């Protein structure tokens, strides 16, 4: 029902940033690169049309190329018996959960550079536990998270 926090562990200018979230989030500040990189991190996690291009050399901090990019998003998943989007997630997640952690869900993105074909591959995992996250299944160009979420990007 409600988002919890996003941990960005490596991106274009993020070292290790743990931002608590909610519904209806508003970001502001002085530097515009960090705000547009926050929105691009959300787009890389949730939008298929941006995720399919992968990462370049410039999407790592200091162009260091030897560090794994990790982006983790946490949900609450607790407010059931009245909410509709809870069922919308549970019906597609299927058996990736445990009955002990009926609440709190994790969606994660990992990336490591290849350094020979010059390409950073993006691998998506999900699960209700901090470790033992399994890969999101998908047939062709799509996976189950594309069936769950619909992202609308509005820019003038």
């Amino acid at each position: 029902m409600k988002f919890s926090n996003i941990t960005i562990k490596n991106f274009r200018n993020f070292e290790k940033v743990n931002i608590n979230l909610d519904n209806k989030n508003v970001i502001f500040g002085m530097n515009d690169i960090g705000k547009t990189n926050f929105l691009y991190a959300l787009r890389f996690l949730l939008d298929k049309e941006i995720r399919k291009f992968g990462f370049n050399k410039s999407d790592y901090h200091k162009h260091d190329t030897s560090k794994k990019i990790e982006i983790i998003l946490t949900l609450d998943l607790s407010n059931y018996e009245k909410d509709e989007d809870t069922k919308k997630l549970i019906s597609v997640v299927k058996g990736a959960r445990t009955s002990a952690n009926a609440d709190v869900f994790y969606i994660a993105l990992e990336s490591k550079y290849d350094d020979k074909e010059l390409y950073g591959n993006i691998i998506l995992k999900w699960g209700s536990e901090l470790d033992n996250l399994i890969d999101i299944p998908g047939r062709g160009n799509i996976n189950a998270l594309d069936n769950v979420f619909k992202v609308i990007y509005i820019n003038p």
Partner: protein, 499 residues
């Protein structure tokens, strides 16, 4: 209009739990896919449905009539439904992590008969099999225990599936019944149960007919309907489905002119009755399936050589010894079609064995039936079919039926060819026309039947095959006079239009 359309209008516009008591065949797949299409059209939410059968041939037929969808619907057998939706995703949660996920369903060598040793086998050597007694289900009991023991299985199976469509409830195990009313009662899922009551049940040995006979008399929370699949398609043709010989003569409506019947002159030959109706009258179509149901096989072959001199080359398959009423025709017909054709796939043979979903083990029986590809006409058929029926279960449904199967390939051919490919212009007799439906039925007057006041059920079941057009001629003047006497007996002035 009548019972077919008003039952369709009632059943399609329902929203509750539905119980349909239909007849024998007549397109249960049609009403099933029509209700499925209506329910998927009226719904705009994220929920999906689950269609449940026994044979996956019906599943590919259902998705062929349906088309393609990415909503997440499940079409298949109940074994696959229980395996992939309840057992496999939640076996590691319901019974601890020490129970294994990745497992193989094999019910060909297993005959253990307790729950305790069953889940000992599932924990230690991770094979799920079957019970020893035929009227049990280890898989459905395990699914019920998983659903009652695991929370997240209940959350998933409530948050995904909206309606569940059950077919062939007349032959269903009581554990399937327990799981289905557990899904109906606590988790609040809607159910669409179809079937027929009693009337010579078969398939999935161990049937328990009191299951379907438990929700006809005493059940209350179910919208009940009779047969909704029509005896005949279209509207005007259905009139002679209400003809019979008595009682249902009162149930038929009055019409001043029936458009679906064409009567013609009787002096000239049929071989250009067809040419007059197809070309001059533009009534019949050669490219549509064009079938005359007649009897008296000698005059049938006379009509055959007459029509080969006509040119369109009608084909005759007579009453095979395989065509008698037996509980095992549908699979050994696939065995003989795979053996004697040459190129029929082994998965086409795999599509009918009880609960199917059989991977990795089709070669075990294809070795046996590849040993059946030797001609060896004397005595090898008995022991190879014996070890086949030991392999494929449904045992001791033979002795008379093994001889009925034997007389097919005796003399190496029963009719030199068989129903191999798709060809038009077929002829069937009354002993073998039951089951397969014909687009255009052109009986040709049912020679010397009506004025004798007998042979009436034969031309009645000849007229049961027609969809859009049927023709009845007064081949004799006294035939027309007895038609007039019969329509005085109906108290209905016109039931047949003559052009």
């Amino acid at each position: 209009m009548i019972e077919d359309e008003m039952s369709r209008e009632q059943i399609i516009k329902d929203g509750g739990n539905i119980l349909v008591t239909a007849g024998a065949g007549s397109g249960k797949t049609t009403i099933l896919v029509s209700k499925i299409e209506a329910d998927l059209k009226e719904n705009k939410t994220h929920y999906s449905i689950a269609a449940v059968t026994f044979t996956n041939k019906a599943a590919k037929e259902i998705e062929g009539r349906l088309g393609y969808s990415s909503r997440g619907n499940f079409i298949g057998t109940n074994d696959g439904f229980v395996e992939s939706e309840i057992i496999r995703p939640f076996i590691k949660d319901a019974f601890g992590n020490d129970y294994p996920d990745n497992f193989t369903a094999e019910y060909f060598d297993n005959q253990f008969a307790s729950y305790d040793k069953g889940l000992q086998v599932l924990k230690y050597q991770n094979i799920l099999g079957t019970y020893s007694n035929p009227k049990k289900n280890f898989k459905f009991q395990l699914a019920l225990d998983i659903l009652k023991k695991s929370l997240v299985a209940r959350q998933y199976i409530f948050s995904k599936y909206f309606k569940i469509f059950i077919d062939e409830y007349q032959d269903s195990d009581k554990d399937m019944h327990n799981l289905f009313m557990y899904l109906k009662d606590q988790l609040k899922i809607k159910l669409f149960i179809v079937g027929d009551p009693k009337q010579s049940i078969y398939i999935w040995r161990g049937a328990e007919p009191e299951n379907f006979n438990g929700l006809i008399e005493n059940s209350t929370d179910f919208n009940k309907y009779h047969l909704t699949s029509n005896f005949r398609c279209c509207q005007d043709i259905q009139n002679y489905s209400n003809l019979f010989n008595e009682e249902t003569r009162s149930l038929i409506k009055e019409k001043n002119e029936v458009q679906n019947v064409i009567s013609i002159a009787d002096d000239m030959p049929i071989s250009d009755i067809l040419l007059k109706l197809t070309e001059e009258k533009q009534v019949l179509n050669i490219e549509a399936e064009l079938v005359i149901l007649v009897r008296r096989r000698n005059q049938a072959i006379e009509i055959m050589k007459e029509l080969n001199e006509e040119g369109f080359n009608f084909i005759f398959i007579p009453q095979t010894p395989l065509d008698r009423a037996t509980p095992n025709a549908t699979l050994l017909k696939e065995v003989i079609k795979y053996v004697k054709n040459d190129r029929y796939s082994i998965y086409d043979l795999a599509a009918e064995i009880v609960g199917n979903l059989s991977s990795r083990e089709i070669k075990e029986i294809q070795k046996i039936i590849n040993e059946l590809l030797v001609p060896n006409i004397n005595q090898v058929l008995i022991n190879q079919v014996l070890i086949n029926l030991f392999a494929k279960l449904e045992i001791t449904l033979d002795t008379r039926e093994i001889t009925a199967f034997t007389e097919v390939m005796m003399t190496n051919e029963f009719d030199i060819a068989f129903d191999t490919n798709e060809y038009l212009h077929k002829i069937f007799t009354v002993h073998s026309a039951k089951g397969l439906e014909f687009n255009q039925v052109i009986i040709t007057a049912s020679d010397y039947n009506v004025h004798y006041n007998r042979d009436t059920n034969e031309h009645y079941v000849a007229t049961t095959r027609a969809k859009d057009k049927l023709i009845v001629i007064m081949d004799n003047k006294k035939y027309s006079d007895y038609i007039e006497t019969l329509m005085k007996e109906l108290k209905i002035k016109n039931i047949i239009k003559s052009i």
